[model samples]
Target: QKPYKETYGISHITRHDMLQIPEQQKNEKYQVPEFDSSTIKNISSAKGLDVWDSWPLQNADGTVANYHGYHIVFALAGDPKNADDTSIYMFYQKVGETSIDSWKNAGRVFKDSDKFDANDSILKDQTQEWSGSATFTSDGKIRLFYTDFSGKHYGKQTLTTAQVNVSASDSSLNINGVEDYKSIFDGDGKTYQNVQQFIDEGNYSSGDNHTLRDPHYVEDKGHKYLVFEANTGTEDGYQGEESLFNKAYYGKSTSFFRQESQKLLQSDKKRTAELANGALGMIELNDDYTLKKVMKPLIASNTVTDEIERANVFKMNGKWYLFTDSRGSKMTIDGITSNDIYMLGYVSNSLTGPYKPLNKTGLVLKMDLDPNDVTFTYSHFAVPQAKGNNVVITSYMTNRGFYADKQSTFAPSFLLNIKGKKTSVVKDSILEQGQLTVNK
Candidate 1:
């Protein structure tokens, strides 16, 4: 049975009206692991964060919470300096920022920056990107992934340079400074084949080469599989829709093909209001490094997907669940600004699921979190922490670019709780009683 399947009274004390996320009647001691602290250690290059401004979580009374949104977990490379155009950098963020949420950028696991790229020219593909929701491979190697996007696609530029990136270490795969075996942008017909490698492959434009979004991976049993959030906009809001709706795509490790070419199990076609945008996918791998099957979509978006476009999955108790930020607002460049977007969620039974929303529509985070923070949406990403290892990390980004006074804000990785069956922000993760603040 799905979460929304049950009917309950709409009372303030019962549950979250729109979301139906069960409320806690009593608070108890939240235990977490020490290894959770180790995850946040030694993070170097932490700047130019992304998800924070676009996807923020709210308090029940409506306020932006610190643990919500995407930001730099830690800097991987380059300077936050405006002059360094060629410098590669790292990015991070979290998804599902409910009170019992797994706010992202905790360990600052995700990385982003221009310094991490291979190219040097701005006209070229070497621009800003975000890395998040990553996992290590079976061969004892890390496969860091990300999404690449810019505001140019608001209407004028039909071909957005967005892509799915995969980075790895040299020792594990027995290769040189972290690189890639294949990438999702092969369709663009360019030279840079994968995120880590800049191999000379000709004009590999759209179709089996690129899907223009972020991809998620799951290590189930022993196999590996991937899922992508595909979108083409019909118009422009803060951005333009290149005339496409969002869709979920899938593939496996053995085949490792693009969604267009790969045979995938997709979700039901979404209407504008249902699967508006940011369609995320998850998988459950086997004991070995083989993909069992691509997990299906539980919830869908309707319009202009928000930034940090990826679906996050985790296992609570025994059942597996997939969560994503529903930037429940459509983009339309009507020459006017409006905070029309909202936040919501969906739940499912297993990794490969037929999930449904706990509510027909969910509320966006409160504006009081940051009034000037235009992109106040929820950024959700997390890991099902073990016993004493009860830390949930996430990234929070600022709306303004790095050049502004406040610049692009970023928070170091944090620690939270995920005990028994439910997940919530850990007390230790926050510095004060009920807040996460950066000391000036």
Candidate 2:
């Protein structure tokens, strides 16, 4: 039986929740290897970095030319001494190559100075510049989707475009007019609404109702899509929702909490909150690259305490996969409890339905030890570049903790394998340290 069958709107269920079923019905066919940090190495060592998210794009020749079959775009949060500011940068690398040197830093691609205005709210705090995702438009420009963070400029997704120039003679790359960024999708025009406006208007009622960020770009069939993090709004003064604390104490069958939670889950008012708390929202783009329509929640976490950040979706060998950076949460399966930053994933046959966990433990890439601890891996980017039949995944590690030495490095890349209807990690191949291909 489906664990959350009563929650009609939820399409994704965690492995911890699914394990409650009978052994044969559980279909325990997939597993994630323990994180092997030694196999992963730093990709960027520039003046202190924050988060790195990347995508694979072909040169005019339709081949993996420059960095290694992909271009990694990331946010640089100033130097090591102070996390005072933010800017976006790009680096090119391949998955398996002959060279093992540092990635060729292509320099700053986007900055606040390029797009922010004096009247904008993001200017309220100079440090709010955030992570963004990139894709190649059919016309050859690189389309970037990012967040404004604060309700400054109305708290919505910001779209910018730049010309990508790759030199055939020297293989040097330059993204031009990045500072001349413009906005396409805003929170008005009867098509969109700001987070605060949507929250105050009773669209959702979470404590942090204004949380919306992390835009990812992908293409399927003949159309392009952007899926990002957002909270679905609820009715005013709605208290029917059960808190995690209550669930921990009363369990799932207690009459009072269960009744209230069930009512909340089944209420018409709840249905009104389509992209409710901890939801991954999907948007279809028109040929002109404007908002075509905001679809229903593709994947909802069904919780208030845990935030799903930096989400991505891609299809491989006829199956679709969803990956996200899960923060401030813990999963207790069979009474084994641990808290840490987790790289979680789900798989589905179609883009629109029941997404099941890719691993029985609910995590493919696990990091950190405490949910409250800020020192660990995050913003994991899965590059489409493959080695044989595996997908390459990379994440960031910082030096803010006592667990290891205090220096930030991009963890070595790991592989995700797809077998039949399930997925797993090759335990021994976690750290291949494959030779990098020489660009020159």
Candidate 3:
């Protein structure tokens, strides 16, 4: 008899007649319970509450304890009557363990203290910290990688990290252990690449500046890699401006848009960027977590024109999977407008690729809950469980005032399937049985 790793009575992987439980499924489909708006609202109701970016905490046995994880939210900071200084807050959930309330107010774990700015641009101004990722270090400390935005300049963004000691037994975070926040990328001397210089070199749009964000941390074997988003365009000499820029948009004389649009509309073939595209910039880290070398773009696609927001490079079954979220990107999809945001995916035999799209249209997931609704899904990220060949993908749902009520402003998690180079959501037929069950 072959021993198997099992979850939901499904055999995920097998070993030498010995049963094993998976810690996380990087590229596998899962049938798990989904989170709905009502369920999330019931967790806690506060004025002006919006939550997103769920990062799971590991149990003592190292399984993704989703019911116990970190989430970013917005709530009252100083006064209740006025929303003047509503700030980003980090909250925790111990779902099955608590009856009074599953979600607990963990207090504000991050605030823009103006101490991390090396450029002084963000140092002097007020800022907001949100949309962060978390991973436990080998020493049992939690390292958080998050984004910081200046008060008035929405585009002035920076990637930063903080190290804190968190107690699993009580879900209390000892921020005193939290290290002084450091700027990982500021688009100048501190960044992997200078965006302003890149733009001046004509490899990016003149209007492009300060769009670097969304830091994802992954550990493979003993090496650590940080993947973030960047904006890149065709170099002046490499791809003619005639095939790169649209004159109407840039107010420059160029034939780029005409040829580019034709190619986009006519060809079904996957394309590498000839001109402008959003890029996934990667950084290799030394064992001590210092910078090693910046690798070339892991994946650059013509499909991404705005900016690559979240790029998660995950390894499963010896293959590399890249999941990315692109908003304000132009792409043609059936039943979805070009303005609609979508999650794209690619797979490579090697860590670095020339990766091909996992799906025919390079679209792995999208949300159009209401055909009449216009607000697009803002952002999404995946949380892989420890004991299964499956994952839960979460995204922020908004109606953008297209609906009269403008209802439902929370993120929801759905099970996804991963097979070989293909990844998708579980079929609706099996979804009812996929509801997640938590053990008390």
Candidate 4:
């Protein structure tokens, strides 16, 4: 019926997909395999160093790049006790070596010139550093890309970049050429929601606000691109009618089973008024790391959800797989919205898509739909392993809603199996301390 394909440069998460969540959850095979990884001792309590939204240093082509026999990772560390006191912090632990106990927290990688002994000195002015990515450039240097938040109490957001110097003789990584930190791109009014529009909407007061951040780099066949979390442009939003497969959407109101959902549609004016838009945005880049062109979105959702975040792509077995972490709280489904987090996946025949959801619902990892679950995990990045469709997924565990454990640390990593359009978590394959080591 060509119902799910992109229309007006926009794709959708139809009532078709949401309708499957209820029946899907009843299948034991569909639940996300959970592992209690909260036992990893905090990096520090006095420093209030809580970490979240981490990413491993990646190669220019988006594999888990290794540095001096170790996997270097950068994460947002802050005192959750204090509001948004976040900064980019570096951590390194040996690959296929000893325990997670060996992780060394190299506190604040970007520091004030007066605080650190450096010369091309620039003030670390970002009020808060949100999630970004680190990639070893083709010229053998690390380019650290991050979200720079500032302007009147960090109200403004920009995609920023800086170079990192790595000591060849030993394991040391520091922010080099801090003065060259550049705000690469904010957003174009035509292709993405600009910062002015976001500020005017006063959406920051709401939780999980509209994003113009999370620039994940992927290079395919000599072209450099950054696919990121973003919102669709200035276009107004509305309900997507791609052959809505929901029973309540098409069924008679007199039907008993469809009555509840029908009432939900009748009462909610949001069903009529414009809804929020989310998109997996793309941009072509020059070798100098400048924005070449703000390409059309790889995928866009007008009335599907408010945000599609932490989106990234990697080439696996000749096909490209894109995965993003999404929360149930933002979904527009009548009965399926909740606090539960999901790892949604899509596959494409090429670097850019025409992408299709895996396992029908774009649900790769479903971490049980329990509202009472205090220990929630977020930001799941699927690290492709050595072979055989075994992808190691990494994320941070948190107690954000209840703060039950008072810790924000790496959640237990796990294994995933992907074959064609199907995916499933490997049973009991949780790796301790978010370890991404593949048993070669």
Question: Which candidate leads the pack in lDDT?
Answer: 4
Residues 250-321, candidate 1, lDDT per residue (tens digit)?
Answer: 112223323322121132212222222323433344333233443332333322232214455545555554
The root-mean-square deviation over C-alpha atoms between each candidate and the true structure, in angstroms, is 14.7, 7.2, 12.0, 5.2
Clashes of each: 113, 23, 11, 0
Instruction: Give me the runs in candidate 3 sitting further than 4 Å from their true place.
Output: 1-47, 57-88, 95-101, 111-126, 151-154, 167-177, 188-210, 233-275, 328-339, 369-377, 399-410, 429-440
Q: Where in model 4 is the C-alpha error above 4 Å?
A: 1-6, 37-39, 44-48, 113-125, 151-154, 168-179, 202-208, 235-265, 269-273, 369-374, 400-406
What's the C-alpha lDDT at position 65 in model 4? 75
Global lDDT of each model?
0.30, 0.48, 0.46, 0.67
Supply the TM-score for candidate 2: 0.69
Error of 2 at 136 (Å): 2.8
TM-score for each of the candidates:
0.46, 0.69, 0.67, 0.84
Per-residue lDDT of model 4, residues 256-367, tens digit only: 3244334444555244213446778888888888788888777765545767788878887778888887777776665565755677888888878878778887777766
* lDDT per residue (tens digit) for residues 105-180 in model 3: 6666654443443344454553556454666666656566666656465445566666654454455433333464
Q: Assess candidate 3 and give its TM-score to the true structure.
A: 0.67
Model 2 accuracy (lDDT, Cα): 0.48
The local lDDT score (0 to 100) that residue 67 gets in candidate 2 is 34
The Cα error of candidate 4 at residue 38, in Å, is: 7.3
